[PDB]
Each structure stands twice: as structure tokens, then as C-alpha cells.
Design a protein around this ligand. Structure first.
Ligand SMILES: [Y+3]
Ligand SMILES: [Y+3]
Ligand SMILES: [Y+3]
Ligand SMILES: [Y+3]
Ligand SMILES: [Y+3]
Ligand SMILES: [Y+3]
Ligand SMILES: [Y+3]
Ligand SMILES: [Y+3]
Lengths: 100, 14, 91
């Protein structure tokens, strides 16, 4: 090969995505999580915000590890699975409520 | 739709 | 339609990182000093946002990852507790 020009746009798309990500992160972190929870009364709404927070951090850690050139994504993949597990419990709970 | 699919899917490598 | 911009943005980053990873980045990173640099900056940019998330919660590599496992554990327990309480109130 020796041709880097093909590799560069991959990065640009990545950087573009990161810039796009920042404002959203600032919105999320505009208040501490605990302060956000207080601003909620619905237990359901609370569970949602938390699962979301777990999702973003895990994903951002995942993306980090990929770019680092980490071969093995299993520790993050394992944690990501665990998060899905808890997100799954949230939904099945909803179904139980619906039937109720 | 599943959010976690993005972890599995293959990149658009040249 | 309640669409989540944040989660959509998060996914774009993962795709972008992943797609980037598929290339022989190590080959170019080692080949070109200029490339290595920007790349670290973008990763740091990604790193900055992730630590900001951690700063929001506020509850050596070995020593480091261990620390990450600890935060995920903190988040997931709050969640389990939230779930346990809904299940209890129903029951
Ligand atoms: Y900030
Ligand atoms: Y899937
Ligand atoms: Y804090
Ligand atoms: Y030390
Ligand atoms: Y130390
Ligand atoms: Y230490
Ligand atoms: Y130590
Ligand atoms: Y329990």
C-alpha cells in the first residue's frame, strides 16, 4: 500500500461524529446525575436516565478501545452485555405494567 | 431496532 | 416521535471508530508522525467526553481499568435497585 489518503477520511468521519457528540454530552452533564434524578418523581423515568448513562459510557469506552488498537473487546463487550441485560429487565417490566 | 447491533456490525473497510 | 439525538450521536461515533479501526491504523500511526498526532487528539477528544460523563456521576493501566469496572458497577446497582423497587411496589 503505503497510501494513507484512503485511511484519512475514515478519521474525518470519526472526528465529525465526535464534534457532533460533544453538545449532546454537555446537555447530559449540564447537571450532576444525582441532581437530575432529584428533578424526577417517576421511578420509571429514573431507571431510564440511569440506563442511558450506563449505555453512553460503555459505548464511548468501546469506541475508545477500538481506536486504541485494542485487539480484544471482550471486557467492554462483557460489560455492554450486562447493560443490555438491565435494559432488557426495564422493558419486560413495562410489559408487565401494560398487562396490569 | 437494537442499539447494540453497532458493536457487532462490520466496518466499511476498503 | 421522541427521537433520541444523544444515542444516535453515540452510535455514529462507534461506527466511525470501528470503521476507522478496520484500517491498518497501527501501520499508518507508526509510519506517519503527523497522523499519529491528530489521531491521539481525536481519541483524547473522545476521551474528554467520557471523563466528563464520569465527572457527572462522581460516586497504572490495570489500576485504571479496574477503576472503570468500578463505575459501571456503581451505575448498574442504582439500576438494579430501581428495578427492585418497582417490582416490590407492584408486589
Ligand atoms: Y463539559
Ligand atoms: Y442484535
Ligand atoms: Y462530580
Ligand atoms: Y502510580
Ligand atoms: Y496511583
Ligand atoms: Y493505583
Ligand atoms: Y497499582
Ligand atoms: Y436484586
Amino acid at each position: 500500500m503505503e497510501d494513507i489518503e484512503k485511511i484519512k477520511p475514515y478519521v474525518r468521519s470519526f472526528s465529525k461524529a465526535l464534534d457532533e457528540l460533544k453538545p449532546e454530552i454537555e446537555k447530559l452533564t449540564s447537571k450532576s446525575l444525582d441532581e437530575q434524578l432529584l428533578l424526577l418523581s417517576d421511578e420509571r423515568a429514573k431507571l431510564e436516565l440511569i440506563n442511558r448513562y450506563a449505555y453512553v459510557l460503555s459505548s464511548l469506552m468501546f469506541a475508545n478501545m477500538k481506536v486504541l488498537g485494542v485487539k480484544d473487546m471482550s471486557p467492554i463487550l462483557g460489560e455492554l452485555k450486562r447493560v443490555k441485560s438491565y435494559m432488557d429487565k426495564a422493558k419486560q417490566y413495562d410489559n408487565r405494567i401494560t398487562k396490569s | 431496532t437494537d442499539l447494540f447491533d453497532v458493536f457487532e456490525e462490520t466496518p466499511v473497510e476498503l | 416521535e421522541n427521537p433520541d439525538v444523544l444515542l444516535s450521536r453515540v452510535i455514529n461515533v462507534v461506527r466511525a471508530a470501528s470503521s476507522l479501526a478496520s484500517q491498518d491504523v497501527d501501520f499508518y500511526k507508526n509510519l506517519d508522525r503527523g497522523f499519529s498526532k491528530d489521531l491521539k487528539s481525536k481519541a483524547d477528544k473522545l476521551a474528554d467526553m467520557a471523563n466528563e460523563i464520569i465527572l457527572s456521576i462522581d460516586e497504572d493501566i490495570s489500576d485504571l481499568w479496574n477503576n472503570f469496572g468500578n463505575i459501571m458497577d456503581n451505575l448498574l446497582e442504582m439500576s438494579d435497585h430501581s428495578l427492585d423497587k418497582l417490582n416490590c411496589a407492584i408486589n
